[PDB]
Amino acid sequence: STGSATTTPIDSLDDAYITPVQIGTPAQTLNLDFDTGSSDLWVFSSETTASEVDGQTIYTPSKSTTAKLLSGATWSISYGDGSSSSGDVYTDTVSVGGLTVTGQAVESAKKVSSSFTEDSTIDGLLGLAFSTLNTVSPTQQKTFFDNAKASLDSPVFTADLGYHAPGTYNFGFIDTTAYTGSITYTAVSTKQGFWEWTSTGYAVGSGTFKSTSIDGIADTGTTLLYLPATVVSAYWAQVSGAKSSSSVGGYVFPCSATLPSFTFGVGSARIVIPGDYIDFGPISTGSSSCFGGIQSSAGIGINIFGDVALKAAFVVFNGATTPTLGFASK
């Protein structure tokens, strides 16, 4: 089997991407944030504290003839950005782009943090990291991909995120028309539960490539590119007037600037992020100070190849017995 679904930016900045997901019988379609950095499929629901729901579409398990309470199971998750959610668990039928999993754990939120409430466009998350990170207790549950894998034509999914435009998540096949050149594959460590890999270096603009190992995670659920402070300083030094602002929370730059590109290495291959992808616009409405899309990972504890990086590539998440990651230009 295969599946193919369009993923759409939630706003003009590509802060996140939503993908329609069919849950239950008859189908209830929710728009979920596909997140290769986590492993829970959770949704706003009829059980979510009413004051914490503000415009989201909810899953109502009592209206699904295939929903079953997973007795005794609870979940609770905290994300790198400080947001969180928790609740109980149903199993139900879940379909993405024509690919159907029966008996998928659907984690129903009883509580969500303010960041989730305040974003009316995201109805929940669909985790695509390794199932070892799944938070359901006392019986850990599998991701949608893990459940689908054996049935897929090939045990892979691909992320093709757009810049200020829709893109595609495919399951079970590689669309050879969706990228240019060849896909370069690179090793993955699953030791921390992530799609963790090592970039071979970077360049700023038309500058020389610096060969250096940068361990990080491919994370569709993180907006920005978080890299070591040395790398980030070298980038922003090429933008007149750019500076790190402790009050704003990262590097800012004059909105009148033209940003240089940023290149990262994948083996001997190179992925170029155009400068415009690094512009996250005014820090507040009407400001001439703009927020940067490349930020320091210092104090996150891990480097994160988030959407800023991934949207410059066609990315293969290869879930074979020994997982790997593939990157192609597009």
- SS3 for the chain is CCEEEEEEECCCCCCCEEEEEEECCCCEEEEEEEECCCCCEEECECCCCHHHCCCCCCECHHHCCCCEEEEEEEEEEECCCCCEEEEEEEEEEEEECCEEEEEEEEEEEEEECHHHHCCCCCCEEEECCCHHHCCCECCCCCCHHHHHHHHCCCCEEEEECCCCCCEEEEECCCCCCCCCCCCEEEECECCCCCCEEEEEEEEECCCCCEEEEEEEEECCCCCCEEECHHHHHHHHCCCCCCEEECCCCEEEEECCCCCCCEEEEECCEEEEECHHHHEEEECCCCCCEEEECEEECCCCCCEEECHHHHCCCEEEEECCCCCEEEEECC
Which method was used? X-ray
CB burial readout 146-178, b (16+ within 10 A) else e:
bbbbeebeebbbbbbbbeeeebbbbbbbbeeee
Domains defined along the chain, listed by start = 5-174 (2.40.70.10), 175-330 (2.40.70.10)
CA distances from 180 to 8, 183, 184, 204, 314 (A): 22, 8, 11, 22, 9
CB 5 within 8 A of CB 168: yes
Classify the phi-psi angles of 120: left when phi > 0, otherwise alpha if psi is within -120 to 50, otherwise beta. alpha
Residue 61: cis peptide before it, omega within 30 degrees of 0:
no
Closest C-alpha among 310, 183, 201, 292 to residue 245: 292
CB atoms inside a 10 Å sphere around CB 18: 20
Show which residues are catalytic. 35, 199
Which amino acid does the sequence have at 207? G
Say which residue the tokens 């291959």 belong to.
269
CB 129 within 8 A of CB 194: yes
Sign of CA dihedral 36, 326, 145, 161: positive
d(C-alpha 213, C-alpha 142), whole Å: 32
Q: Tell how strand 41-43 and strand 99-112 pair up.
A: parallel
Q: Quick one: how far is CA 221 from the chain centroid?
A: 2
Give 71's contacts (C-beta < 8 A, 6+ positions apart).
none
329: β partners: none
Length of the chain: 330
Which amino acid does the sequence have at 77? I
d(C-alpha 182, C-alpha 160), whole Å: 15
Give 285's contacts (C-beta < 8 A, 6+ positions apart).
none
Give 68's contacts (C-beta < 8 A, 6+ positions apart).
90, 91, 92
